[PDB]
Ligand binder design. Structure first.
Ligand code: MG
Ligand code: MG
Ligand code: MG
Lengths: 191, 195, 348, 139, 109
RNA sequence: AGAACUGGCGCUGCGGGAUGAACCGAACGCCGGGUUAAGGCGCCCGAUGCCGACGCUCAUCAGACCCCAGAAAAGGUGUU
RNA sequence: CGUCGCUUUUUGAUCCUUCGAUGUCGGCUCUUCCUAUCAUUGUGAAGCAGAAUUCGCCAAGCGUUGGAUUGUUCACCCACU
RNA sequence: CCAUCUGUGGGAUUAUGACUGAACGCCUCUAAGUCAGAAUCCCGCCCAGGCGGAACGAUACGGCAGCGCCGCGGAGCCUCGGUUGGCCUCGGAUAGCCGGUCCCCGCCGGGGGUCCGGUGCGGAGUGCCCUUCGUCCUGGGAAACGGGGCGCGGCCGGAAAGGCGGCCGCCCCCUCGCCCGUCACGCACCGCACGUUCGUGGGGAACCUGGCGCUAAACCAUUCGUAGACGACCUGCUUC
């Protein structure tokens, strides 16, 4: 079709101040700072208005599958406002039958060392993407918590535990064993 | 004398088609920094059609047979080779006015390099379509000189940012030196006929 | 079409030009790649095999049936007198490979280096390096010889050491030293180059380079067997007795339609005398040989803690075809590439 | 980023084609790659020019959408484009590029002799600043 | 005391794909790359100056190792501003890529 | 394998179809200038080195010019 | 019940090349290639509890034997894997 | 295998399982963007080293010769090709370029406010030389460095193929090394081509030629047997 432009706007609260180098978006907030580069996506980024700080991403002309990519800009941008003002927290619990799944943390949250996964002698040292850290939970059994500012660094690192506790050569309809995520929340709440 | 073509940002066959016509016509052409040549289509596709080229091999001995070069200076050289009549002596000499290099050698790091707008990626690809670098499709297939080339380029490019430091030091000076006085009589006739 | 019975290829195609090697001394194709976090050391060393014996040892190995029992092992021994450092080479990394930057040879060079630089030491005037030694002593050459070290330190990044053997300490006939060129893998290239300026024209023993119960490589040229047939060079099966015109031949050497014999088929030619690398040879003992005359000649080799007898490792009657080992040695578990009296290069 | 748009009234230059070098005003767009333009005071009348042939400037004009020839003409001169066009640095570049193009053989002699005279004087007064630069940095 | 000739190179002969017509050359005069701007060069006298080892000269009266083949520009060739041109001998085919020398003779300007 | 009508090949070069008996143009004394046919004009390789027009299409098996030298039923919230 | 295809390891059909000759079965020996995968690697699906099987996927890297009867190709049996 | 010893790791990923996330207000492994990922693949290890380079050694006496290096002028032989050079940022492309107060990295560079220009004019549709016939007489503008060097000496700069460059001290020297004007001559060879450069190019061979330097090594024969069909290969041959 090659339509005349589309645009989404992003309402930005005051405790986060966004600058842009170009198609790079620099997001600074209370609990740190994080940046992305969108130099592959062929759009313009214009932050408009004083005192209100609106961010309008608009793509002129464009094909239908390049109309689908202006919404992907503003959704990654809102997850940078959210992550730098509230953080991300993925709570994962250990689902197991007869064998308990023992889990510790070796180095400062950066290493999770899983052992006794379904009676096995082989350890599973899962290192994490830099920026996230772990915690054994309190007032709940067998739970692990992951906290950080970037959702792609929390969730990919959450997938490295869930992929490591994988049952081979067996039925996975029974033998439900592993450390699966349970909740998708934030570090600071109710804001 | 010789045109010096900086190879990066160019496409493989659009650049090689212009060189293979300028070199039958009697010019000397030096293509420099072939590591940065783009090639259209995504990287996995261009890496497949070079691995399909590698299995082309004469059965009875591979020592005689197709010589699969691995440096991007020679990948680009064999692309120009296939656009020249290289089995005649009018085409043997045509391959010999082409000195294609890799990185930028010490004769050629201090010459002004030209580009070809007829073969640049920005001009000739539509930007929503993918491309492959010739640097890492060489590296994925058998080339062992990527890191020792990038080390020498960032030492080469650092010796030129101090050259361009002091080149625009002179340009700031001679723009303030032309501020002064009494050359207005000569600017009467140059502004009149395109300063 | 389709042999009816599977069978694998005879011989390996990874050693395929079964050729007389172009070198008698084994060439290190690859030294160990370093990081500068290690202390400064050598990596390779020349040696001459004398022959083999065997051994008895109390092998500790839990799990096995070999545990806490005496087990014999074939051992070769290699006579290694100390090397003597002559040269320093510098290699600068390029986008075409390593390239020799320049070399600096020692202030005064031995008799047996200089014999390696000739094809007829008898007819020669013995004139090699005679004008090169006079740039160590003149004032103008000396300031631009130590400038070639300061330019070596600036640009080139891997440096090597030219060292030769002392053939005078050996029972052989040869008296030409073998001149090797071995890589130092220390820390920075300033400390790596100052460690060799310190120690030109000086001896480097074999215990300073290698250690006991440490595992190395052996590089050399094999026993030469000559021009041998298909069934001995390639271990092809003999044909039956009834075969006209010959037993020890390969019968079919190709199909019709590739109308051309392949490299992958077996046919007769030179067997043996090939350049090979054995990997993972353990050192059993570093020897020390025929020391000071205060006690007139302490032989004392092969005298273990459980032996306590005045023995020496050279066998009763001498090493066959070799001579009599008066120098340091390294003994290696198992078989080792080469004839007796052959230069083989040990390498970490 | 995208400081000048096509728009009803946007005064465009014309690079190539059979109306090359003259200005137009975009009156109406038709579909995606062609636009109805006219120049009422610059001798290119109402017709459809493609966008890759035209050349957007910083001048807008205020007249109603798809007007007649007269109301573009009144808007062309109430804004006084043709005086304001020629006093910009890009109309001076397109004028100077065809002053050099018509430089005859005798005039190119005079452009020569009065160039090597001033290149001496600029090279004297830029080398009398090199001596002045080390004398500053000598203390 | 100065060059008075345009720079050309001899590219090839007038050919189809297989058979070629040796009697007319075709030339790429430099700087002109459009058919509309080659009307200046029609009728100009072009020359192929080359070296030998025997001796010949016209003007000075003392011979040298230089000799020449004279020709003239006939018509344009294609849209790319090159030119076909017919000499008084045929070109040696040694000169493929080498220059020839396009003068400023028989010019209306 | 066997007939009908017409043309051709055999007896026939030439331009083109990369290659070629028969396809497509065109038939031929020896040459110069001009212009075309079929086919083409990124580079082999003459000629688009036109500021050519409108759209369609992404292939981890893309497509690419009569004869003609490789595909079907069926299917796709892939895109138009 | 249908119905669309592929392949040229079956057998035909045809008669283009060869009749001033292309040495015609099988085995043995030996090299390479293909994939329409028996096994080995990584996997998805079961009427997958485990064990064992079964059906697909990337994949031809590496293996695919010792014998009795028979000129056998083919067969069939013993045994190992 | 009838004795004995040894057989070695990295990359990008296929299948597949995922993450973020639209299209399609949700959902979604995919559309852009990321992850894990293998007997495959590519390299390493290992084998061979190219009409492919490199670093370094010594370089022909004898009794006359002989050979390198530097500075030469002279004539002839062979191969011909070119007619002025640009001595350089990175790069982005839905973005770039320049100049500049303040905050920091051993008197340079990075950040931001500020000002510009921007179909690029601090524009290779360009810029520096120049299209310079020479000279003489004779005035203005410019110009106080002198500029060509076979000078002499010193510095440090350039290792990816540095073979090229910058600076300084003394020196035989110029005071026209430019622009405008004055005066008047040089082959004015009587209309005509191969003119005008690179350039005292490259290669070979000898002569007249000043100075500084050098005094070898291969191959055969003989020997060896770590080697061999033959060549090849590994070695010995000191007056102890
Ligand atoms: Mg190596
Ligand atoms: Mg064997
Ligand atoms: Mg017809």
């Amino acid at each position: 079709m090659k339509t005349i432009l589309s645009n989404q706007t992003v309402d930005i609260p005051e405790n986060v101040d966004i600058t842009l180098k170009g198609r790079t978006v620099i997001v600074k907030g209370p609990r740190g700072t994080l940046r992305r580069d969108f130099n592959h996506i062929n759009v313009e980024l214009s932050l408009l208005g004083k005192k209100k700080k609106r961010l309008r991403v608009d793509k002129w002309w464009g094909n239908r599958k390049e109309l689908a990519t202006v919404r992907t800009i503003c959704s990654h941008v809102q997850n940078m406002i959210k992550g730098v003002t509230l953080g991300f927290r993925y709570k994962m619990r250990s689902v197991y039958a007869h064998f308990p799944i023992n889990v510790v943390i070796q180095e400062n949250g950066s290493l999770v060392e899983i052992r006794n996964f379904l009676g096995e002698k082989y350890i599973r040292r899962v290192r994490m993407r830099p920026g996230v850290a772990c915690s054994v939970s309190q007032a709940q059994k067998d739970e692990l918590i992951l906290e950080g500012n970037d959702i792609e660094l929390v969730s990919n690192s959450a997938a490295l535990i869930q992929q490591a506790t994988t049952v081979k050569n067996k039925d996975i309809r029974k033998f439900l064993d592993g450390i699966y995520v349970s909740e998708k929340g934030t570090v600071q709440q109710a804001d | 004398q010789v045109l010096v073509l900086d190879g990066r940002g160019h496409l493989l066959g659009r650049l090689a088609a212009i060189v293979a016509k300028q070199v039958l016509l009697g010019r000397k052409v030096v293509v420099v920094r072939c590591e940065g040549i783009n090639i259209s289509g995504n990287f996995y596709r261009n890496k497949l059609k070079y691995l399909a080229f590698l299995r082309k091999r004469m059965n009875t001995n591979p020592s005689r047979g197709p010589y699969h070069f691995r440096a991007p200076s020679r990948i680009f050289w064999r692309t120009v080779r296939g656009m020249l009549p290289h089995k005649t002596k009018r085409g043997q000499a045509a391959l010999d006015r082409l000195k294609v290099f890799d990185g930028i050698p010490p004769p050629y790091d201090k010459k002004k390099r030209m580009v070809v707008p007829a073969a640049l990626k920005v001009v000739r690809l539509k930007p929503t379509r993918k491309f492959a670098y010739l640097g890492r499709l060489a590296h994925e297939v058998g080339w062992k000189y990527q890191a020792v080339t990038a080390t020498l380029e960032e030492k080469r490019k650092e010796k030129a940012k101090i050259h361009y430091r002091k080149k625009k030091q002179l340009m700031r000076l001679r723009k303030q030196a032309e501020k002064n006085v009494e050359k207005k009589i000569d600017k009467y006739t140059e502004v009149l006929k395109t300063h | 079409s389709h042999r009816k019975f599977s069978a694998p290829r005879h011989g390996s195609l990874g050693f395929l030009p079964r050729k007389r090697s172009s070198r008698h001394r084994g060439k290190v194709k690859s030294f160990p790649k370093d990081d500068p976090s290690k202390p400064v050391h050598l990596t390779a060393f020349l040696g001459y095999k004398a022959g083999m014996t065997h051994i008895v040892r109390e092998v500790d190995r839990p799990g096995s049936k070999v545990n806490k029992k005496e087990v014999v092992e074939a051992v070769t021994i290699v006579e290694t007198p100390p090397m003597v450092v002559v040269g320093i080479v510098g290699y600068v990394e390029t986008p075409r490979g390593l390239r020799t930057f320049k070399t600096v040879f020692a202030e005064h060079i031995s008799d047996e280096c200089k014999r390696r630089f000739y094809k007829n030491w008898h007819k020669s005037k013995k004139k090699a390096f005679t004008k090169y030694c006079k740039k160590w002593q003149d004032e103008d050459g000396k300031k631009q010889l130590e400038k070639d070290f300061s330019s070596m330190k600036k640009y080139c990044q891997v440096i090597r050491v030219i060292a030769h053997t002392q053939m005078r300490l050996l029972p052989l006939r040869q008296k030409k030293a073998h001149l090797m060129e071995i890589q130092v893998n220390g820390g920075t290239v300033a400390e790596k180059l100052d460690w060799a300026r310190e120690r030109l024209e000086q001896q480097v023993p074999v215990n300073q380079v290698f250690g006991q119960d440490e595992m190395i490589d052996v590089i050399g040229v094999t026993k030469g067997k000559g021009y041998k047939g298909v069934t001995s060079r390639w271990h092809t099966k003999k044909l039956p007795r009834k075969t006209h015109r010959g037993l020890r031949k390969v019968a079919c050497i190709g199909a019709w339609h590739p109308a051309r014999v392949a490299f992958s088929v077996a046919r007769a030619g030179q067997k043996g005398y090939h350049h090979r690398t054995e990997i993972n040879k353990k050192i059993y003992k570093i020897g020390q040989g025929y020391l000071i005359k205060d006690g007139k000649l302490i032989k004392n080799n092969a005298s273990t803690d459980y032996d306590l007898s005045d023995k020496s490792i050279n066998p009763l009657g001498g090493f066959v075809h070799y001579g009599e080992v008066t120098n340091d040695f390294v003994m290696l578990k198992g078989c080792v590439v080469g004839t007796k009296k052959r230069v083989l290069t040990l390498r970490k | 980023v995208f400081r000048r748009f096509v728009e009803v009234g946007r005064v465009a230059y014309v690079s190539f084609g059979p109306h090359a070098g003259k200005l137009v005003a975009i009156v109406d767009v038709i579909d995606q790659n062609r636009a109805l333009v006219d120049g009422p005071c610059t001798q290119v009348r109402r017709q459809a020019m493609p966008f890759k042939c035209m050349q957007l400037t910083d001048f807008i004009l205020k007249f109603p959408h798809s007007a007649h020839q007269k109301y573009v003409r009144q808007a062309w001169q109430k804004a006084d484009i043709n005086t304001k066009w020629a006093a910009t640095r890009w109309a001076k570049k397109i004028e100077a590029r065809e002053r050099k193009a018509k430089m005859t053989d005798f005039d190119r002699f005079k452009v020569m002799k009065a160039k090597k005279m001033r290149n001496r004087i600029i090279k004297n007064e830029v080398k009398k600043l090199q001596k002045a630069a080390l004398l500053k940095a000598s203390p | 005391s100065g060059r008075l000739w345009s720079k050309a190179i001899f590219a090839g002969y007038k050919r189809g794909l297989r058979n070629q017509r040796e009697h007319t050359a075709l030339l790429k005069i430099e700087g002109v790359y459009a058919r509309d701007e080659t009307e200046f060069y029609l009728g100009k006298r072009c020359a192929y100056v080359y070296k030998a080892k025997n001796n010949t000269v016209t003007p000075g009266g003392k011979p040298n190792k230089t000799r020449v083949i004279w020709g003239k520009v006939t018509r344009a060739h294609g849209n790319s501003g090159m030119v076909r041109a017919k000499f008084r001998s045929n070109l040696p085919a040694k000169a493929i890529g080498h220059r020839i020398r396009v003068m400023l003779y028989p010019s209306r300007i």
